[PDB]
């Protein structure tokens, strides 16, 4: 029967490892394993947009961060707190979500399954695959690629307020470095990015009508959703993605993205602002796979005859990050 319960996590955390995900997982999670059973001739409706697993992962990562990444100062709901804010070792590890006795996880194995509606190739699993709880905006990093075709998913495409979650099927490497102070940069392939955009443009045309597709930058909100923001080595990187999202689609070299490491950030855990300590000294570098994207679509008046769809990098709600990995699973009570 469909059911909400308290899922527990499993991981490969090491007790002699001071890295903060390891320390957290050592107390919060069982050691990772795997068993998978195929359920014949069963068809089951899914809805990734209403999946309590997402809320649970959210609570866990909020708790992980709260214990691990202490801002020096936090302002929430007009109330101010200050506290010790030591630098930490920070590198996400894979986390699995598992059902306790009496419950099962159903998994949808349909190819290019969009996350809602009926699934005809269904299995049960003891745990999900291992998910790195990567916190970022605009770009989804270090996730899982689609096996077959590029996929776009939305709770309701006709509602432009609903974020569109893109799952790439071939990764795009992004190399980000702050050299030997708040200035940093990212590199990516101009050609790889163009191929990726081309595959997205194709899937979006399938969805909305082969209307002209345009990409434009984020514009209007918090630095967290205007820039590509992410955490590398404990530092909050904010990367200008204008060059990535400036494109028109109708009928070579490296891209270099300027970044800033910020101390004062708007929090994703809760409405408020937080200040962390300045960057550690020395080279700070992350090489990550872009495995997905978060987009929003512009709305309002457009041409009836030849509509053109405008897309911008989005994100902000990290629940969408988790659903981008959790979309094939649901929990049922047996």
């Amino acid at each position: 029967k469909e059911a909400t319960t308290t899922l527990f996590c499993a991981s490969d955390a090491k007790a002699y490892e001071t890295e903060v995900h390891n320390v957290w997982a050592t107390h919060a999670c069982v050691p990772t394993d795997p068993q998978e059973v195929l359920l014949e001739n069963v068809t089951e409706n899914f809805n990734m947009w209403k999946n309590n697993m997402v809320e649970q992962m959210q609570e866990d990562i909020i708790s992980l961060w709260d214990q691990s990444l202490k801002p020096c100062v936090k302002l929430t709901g007009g109330s101010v707190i200050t506290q010790a804010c030591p630098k930490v070792s920070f590198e996400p590890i894979p986390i699995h979500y598992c059902t306790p006795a009496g419950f099962a996880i159903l998994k949808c194995n349909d190819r290019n399954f969009n996350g809602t509606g009926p699934c005809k190739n269904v299995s049960t699993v003891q745990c999900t695959h291992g998910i790195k709880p990567v916190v970022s905006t605009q770009l989804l990093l270090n996730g899982s690629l689609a096996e077959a075709e590029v996929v776009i998913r939305s709770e309701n495409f006709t509602n432009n307020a609903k974020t569109i979650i893109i799952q790439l099927n071939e990764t795009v490497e992004i190399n980000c470095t702050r050299p030997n102070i708040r200035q940093a940069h990212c590199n990516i392939s101009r050609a790889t990015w163009n191929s990726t955009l081309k595959k997205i443009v194709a899937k979006l045309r399938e969805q909305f009508g082969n209307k002209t597709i345009v990409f434009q930058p984020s514009s209007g909100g918090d630095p967290e959703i205007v820039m590509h923001s992410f955490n590398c080595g404990g530092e909050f990187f904010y990367c200008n993605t204008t060059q990535l999202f400036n494109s028109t689609w109708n009928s070579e070299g490296t891209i270099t993205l300027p970044c800033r490491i910020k101390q004062i950030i708007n929090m994703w855990q809760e409405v408020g602002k937080a200040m962390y300590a300045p960057p550690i000294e020395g080279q700070i570098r992350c090489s990550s796979n872009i495995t997905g994207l978060l987009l929003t679509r512009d709305g309002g008046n457009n041409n009836k005859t030849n509509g053109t769809e405008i897309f911008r990098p989005g994100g902000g709600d990290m629940r969408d990050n988790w659903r981008s990995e959790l979309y094939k699973y649901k929990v049922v009570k047996i």
Partner: antibody
Amino acid sequence: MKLMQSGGVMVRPGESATLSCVASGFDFSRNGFEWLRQGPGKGLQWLATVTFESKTHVTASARGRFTISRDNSRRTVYLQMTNLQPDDTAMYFCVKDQTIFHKNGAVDFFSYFDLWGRGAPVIVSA
Amino acid sequence: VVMTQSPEFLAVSLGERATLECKSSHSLLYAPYDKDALVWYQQKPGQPPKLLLDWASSRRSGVSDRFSATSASGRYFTLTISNFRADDVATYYCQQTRWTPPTFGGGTKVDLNR
């Protein structure tokens, strides 16, 4: 909230003219502005839009003849008219449209106008 | 996108009710807001037009409650002026703002019966 217009203008056929509009009392940074045309014994007609990102649309009957632009530092909006003709004789309105910003970053645009300039007569004649 | 109003001229008596009609060739329903993207302006002679109502039925702030409006099928719209008085004599324009470009109703001139 005020839009103070600048006109009007008198001009021989074929000549060019410029109209301006200056915004105060709100946030120029986050609004688009448009130019509307009213004929004598008329009659309302949209001419051009500039969005808050300085994207510009012009009606096709005037495309490559009219041009809209925007100076954010001075909170000013402009209409450049070229090769003006006696037909073009009318009252020109500066107007603020609607720009709606969402939490996830989406932006809706709606071209209706809560805010109107005083209107500026452009008369074209030999 | 064609907007048609009717009648062209409308005479109303000094306490009665004006009923102005506006017809769109297309649906102006804006699905994500579940609102019709249609708007009503008042224009007196010499003045810029004033925005009375937006999304078909919503009075603007400051606008008299004697003004109200109606939408059906995302295509047919009615503007109503109760307690018609001297200062309601004007041209009323409807405007669609669902599609680009925005297009104007062509106007209804309301004057005082007598």
